[PDB]
UniProtKB/Swiss-Prot annotation, chain A:
Sorted UniProt keywords: Nucleus, Transcription, Transcription regulation
GO cellular component, one term: nucleolus
Pfam family, one: Rrn11
Gene this chain is encoded by: RRN11
Assembly and binders: Component of the core factor (CF) complex, which consists of RRN6, RRN7 and RRN11. The CF heterotrimer may further dimerize to form a hexamer. RRN11 interacts with RRN6, RRN7 and SPT15.
Organism of provenance: Saccharomyces cerevisiae (strain ATCC 204508 / S288c) (Baker's yeast)
GO biological process per UniProt: nucleolar large rRNA transcription by RNA polymerase I
Other comments on record: Present with 476 molecules/cell in log phase SD medium.
Signal peptide: none
InterPro entries associated with the record: RNA_pol_I-specific_init_factor, TIF_Rrn11, TIF_Rrn11_budding_yeast
Cellular localisation: Nucleus, Nucleolus
Function summary: Acts as a component of the core factor (CF) complex which is essential for the initiation of rDNA transcription by RNA polymerase I. After binding of UAF (upstream activation factor) to an upstream element of the promoter, CF is recruited in a SPT15/TBP-dependent manner to form a preinitiation complex.
Name under which the protein is recorded: RNA polymerase I-specific transcription initiation factor RRN11
GO function terms (MF aspect): RNA polymerase I core promoter sequence-specific DNA binding; RNA polymerase I general transcription initiation factor activity; TBP-class protein binding
From Swiss-Prot, chain B:
Cysteine-cysteine disulfides: none
Other facts: Three distinct zinc-containing RNA polymerases are found in eukaryotic nuclei: polymerase I for the ribosomal RNA precursor, polymerase II for the mRNA precursor, and polymerase III for 5S and tRNA genes. Present with 14100 molecules/cell in log phase SD medium.
Protein name, entry field: DNA-directed RNA polymerase I subunit RPA135
Residues of the full protein shown: 574 to 631 of 1203
Superkingdom assignment: Eukaryota
Assembly, per entry: Component of the RNA polymerase I (Pol I) complex consisting of 14 subunits: RPA135, RPA190, RPC40, RPA14, RPB5, RPO26, RPA43, RPB8, RPA12, RPB10, RPC19, RPC10, RPA49 and RPA34. The complex is composed of a horseshoe-shaped core containing ten subunits (RPA135, RPA190, RPB5, RPO26, RPB8, RPB10, RPC10, RPA12, RPC19 and RPC40) where RPA135 and RPA190 form the DNA-binding cleft. Outside of the core, RPA14 and RPA43 form the stalk that mediates interactions with transcription initiation factors and newly synthesized RNA.
Length: 349, 58
């Protein structure tokens, strides 16, 4: 039942997509006229590519560009547009297999296929892989840690894994695996596995990797690289302030290497997550110099070199939170962080 | 701005080539010595141990 690790047996699906598009450019062309392989690339050039996310969700409040289009659909008017594209789909419909003739005659009637293409492929290698992908998803849906990674560990040794669920079940399985590994390692191995510092979107028929859940290093954030930083700050928090340390610095220098290109380059949590790691580094230093005036009765301890190191940092953080707002970052509820930071300043006094 | 006097007849206090004020040469020496005292001390946070205090007496 679940999402499979592999390029989709490219055989009938590629010619079903010819007939689908070729009809859509034919029927649409005559809608454009009434208003007054390559076809598939032209269909996407007529509706653009998919930004770095999922569904071109964007507000729902700005432009009230009125659509009352007058329903404009008189059964009689639809069959005027349709009567000629269907006879031009029969030319290519004849050269197509008997299975693809009716598949086209089903989708051109508006029927949808209850025939999951991944419910017929009969290829040994593929065969199993569907069993393993479903096995591991039914095992994390009951938290079976000792069996879920056995299935996970075998699923990647078989030639059919594109990061895919490997990066999305390979991390939790390591959070649920109380034993060996911190999705982190696996997360940092992924980051190096798919930097994709190259800005590639659009162009060709992404039909092998179409999930904003692997890819990027162009603009479109990688979400395993954002999860690597988020899991890393949460891995820094646990049992700090409750020279072998370094981690909150390691994370300050592992974003420093970035400082925009693709990540710096693109805004948000990149900036925000960085400030948040930085804000935590300011609190720890107020604790390590907090309780009952620093530790206790005063400091005499050479004025307060430690207050100046912290005020520099508080002033720096406020710069990172501000540039993350300015550059269009909707992520941060500024009111709460500023109140927290000022009430914390009041601990440093 | 307030001294409004200038000459080798008067001590000029300058910081990094920013002339900030004037005093008597006697106060020149008083300042040089009391300043060095607050430098070796730890009580003048506006006063880093490593400030170099050029006194040139008359």
């Amino acid at each position: 039942m679940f999402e499979v690790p592999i390029t989709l047996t490219n055989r009938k699906f590629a010619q079903r997509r010819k007939l689908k598009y070729q009809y859509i450019n034919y029927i649409s062309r005559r809608f454009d006229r009434i208003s007054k392989s390559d076809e598939e690339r032209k269909f996407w050039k007529k509706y653009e590519k998919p930004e770095k996310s999922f569904e071109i969700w964007r507000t729902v409040s700005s432009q009230n560009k009125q659509p009352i289009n007058k329903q404009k659909m008189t059964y009689h008017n639809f069959k005027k547009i349709e009567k000629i594209p269907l006879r031009k789909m029969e030319i290519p419909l004849l050269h197509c297999t008997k299975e693809n003739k009716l598949y086209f005659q089903s989708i051109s009637r508006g029927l949808e296929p209850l025939k999951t293409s991944t419910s017929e492929v009969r290829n040994y290698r593929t065969r199993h892989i569907v069993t393993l992908t479903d096995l591991l998803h039914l095992n994390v849906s009951r938290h079976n840690w000792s069996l879920a990674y056995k299935i996970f560990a075998t699923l990647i040794r078989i030639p059919g894994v594109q990061i895919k669920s490997l990066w999305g079940i390979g991390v939790e399985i390591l959070d649920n695996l109380s034993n060996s590994s911190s999705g982190l390692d696996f997360l940092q191995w992924m980051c190096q596995i798919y930097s994709s510092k190259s800005r590639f979107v659009q162009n060709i028929n992404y039909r092998s990797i179409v999930p904003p859940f692997q890819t990027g290093s162009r603009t479109h954030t990688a979400k395993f690289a954002i999860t690597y930083l988020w899991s890393s700050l949460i891995n820094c928090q646990k049992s700090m302030e409750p020279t072998e340390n370094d981690l909150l610095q390691e994370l300050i220098d592992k974003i420093s290497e970035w400082v925009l290109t693709p990540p710096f380059m693109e805004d948000a949590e990149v900036w925000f997550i960085y400030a948040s790691c930085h804000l935590l580094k300011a609190d720890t230093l107020s604790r390590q110099f907090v309780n009952d005036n620093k530790n206790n009765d005063l400091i005499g301890l050479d004025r307060d070199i430690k207050i100046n190191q912290v005020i520099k940092h508080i002033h720096y953080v406020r710069t990172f939170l501000k540039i993350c707002l300015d550059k269009g970052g909707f992520a941060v509820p500024s009111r709460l962080i500023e109140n927290q930071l000022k009430s914390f300043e009041s601990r440093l006094y | 701005s307030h001294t409004f006097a200038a000459g080798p007849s008067l001590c000029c206090v300058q910081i990094d080539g920013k002339i900030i004020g004037w005093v008597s040469h006697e106060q020149g020496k008083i300042i040089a010595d009391t300043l060095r005292y607050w430098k070796v001390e730890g009580k003048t946070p506006g006063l880093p141990i490593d400030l170099e205090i050029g006194y040139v007496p008359p």
